[PDB]
Amino acid sequence: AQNPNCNIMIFHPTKEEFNDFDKYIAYMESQGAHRAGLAKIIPPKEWKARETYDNISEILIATPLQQVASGRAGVFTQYHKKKKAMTVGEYRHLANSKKYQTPPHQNFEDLERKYWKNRIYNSPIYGADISGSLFDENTKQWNLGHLGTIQDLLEKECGVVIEGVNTPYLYFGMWKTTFAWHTEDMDLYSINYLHLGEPKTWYVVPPEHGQRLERLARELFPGSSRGCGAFLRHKVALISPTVLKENGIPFNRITQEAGEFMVTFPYGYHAGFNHGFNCAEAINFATPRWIDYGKMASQCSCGEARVTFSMDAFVRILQPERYDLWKRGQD
Ligand SMILES: O=C(O)CNC(=O)C(=O)O
Ligand SMILES: [Mg+2]
Ligand code: NI
Ligand SMILES: [Zn+2]
């Protein structure tokens, strides 16, 4: 078995190997990359996402989210308070202000220490989940707006044509902006490109150990667990590496820098934080290997998770027994 310790693997495809996206994902899996839940892909030196980032300041962040924490430094939830709209140029200025800027630090490890010590005491503002793309239309390789759609994959594998669309999302971050422990909708893959700015630190649990994370989460968030049998789908809970290590949960960590892709694999729980002002683009995708994960994915039916239009068909076709309850939670 390749990669039996479930380490995060880093890949350096050549420009030739960068042509065929599906083929390269399958290659990474042949080397055991999925066992970690997360892989890094460093693009060939010849490649670029677009020519420059000099003209992005007028993008609108319609609903910036202030991420307010509750709990203790290593075990907390966050809620999202909606703020007034602002442009990316306004948000960048805000991120660089004395109130929100990255503190002085020695290295990524020191900054990580500072994040876990101090995150709860601040409420950073995240420009998340903005439909759109920063890939140039002329970028032919690993262009996250030109991937094969999940609806097409389901149709190719299973023969059933379904409604729905699959488009990318932009994320504008600042110091301490946080993504809570989650797997993707329907335990899909994700791919994330860090277009510009400061790094993003990731934590990940191997898919084969995801249920160990879930059991810890039920212990640590006992009211939330009574409320919902899949409350990590709410995407609000944080658990620090120190707490994970104290509880014997297998995990790994890695820091993504600008110009790098990360791929999350089906049922790979992940969480993390931004180092400072940045912009990422991410999208879900599927492969043939995903189908069995989609059929087994948990679902929130309590009403909290509320998701896209396109998840309906995935539930309806892959999980017909669950469909009626889940749809009630959507309505
Ligand atoms: O970058 C973020 O805030 C969150 N991204 C992801 O969870 C992802 O790409 O799957
Ligand atoms: Mg602009
Ligand atoms: Ni994710
Ligand atoms: Zn729920």
Distance from Cα 329 to the centre of ligand 4, integer Å: 8
Distance from Cα 100 to the centre of ligand 3, integer Å: 24
Any known ligand binding at 192?
Answer: yes
E strands present in the chain: 9-11, 38-41, 60-61, 65-72, 75-82, 86-87, 125-131, 169-173, 178-182, 189-197, 200-205, 237-239, 252-256, 261-264, 269-274, 278-285
Token pair of 103, please?
Answer: 């503190």
Resolution of this deposited model, Å: 1.3
User: In 3D, which of 312, 314, 37 has the Cα closest to residue 202?
Assistant: 37
SS3 330: helix
| Nearest ligand 1 atom to alpha carbon 184 | 10
Closest protein CA for atom 2 of ligand 1 = 179
CB atoms closer than 10 angstroms to residue 293: 20
CA distance 96 to 113: 21
Domain ranges of the chain: 1-331
Closest protein CA for atom 9 of ligand 1 = 192
Q: Tell me the CB-side half-sphere exposure of residue 144, using CA atoms within 13 A.
A: 29
CB atoms closer than 10 angstroms to residue 62: 10
Torsion-angle region of 48 (φ positive above 0: left; ψ -120 to 50: alpha; else: beta): beta
CA distance 273 to 84: 23
SS3 151: helix
CATH number of 1-331: 2.60.120.650
Question: Any idea what DSSP says for residue 290?
Answer: H
CA distance 59 to 327: 34
Token pair of 178, please?
Answer: 């946080």
Distance from Cα 213 to the centre of ligand 2, integer Å: 40
Q: Whose atoms come closest to the Cα of 67: which ligand? A: 1
Token pair of 298, please?
Answer: 């948990």
Alpha helices by DSSP H, 200-270:
210-220, 222-227, 241-246
Q: Whose atoms come closest to the Cα of 236: which ligand? A: 4
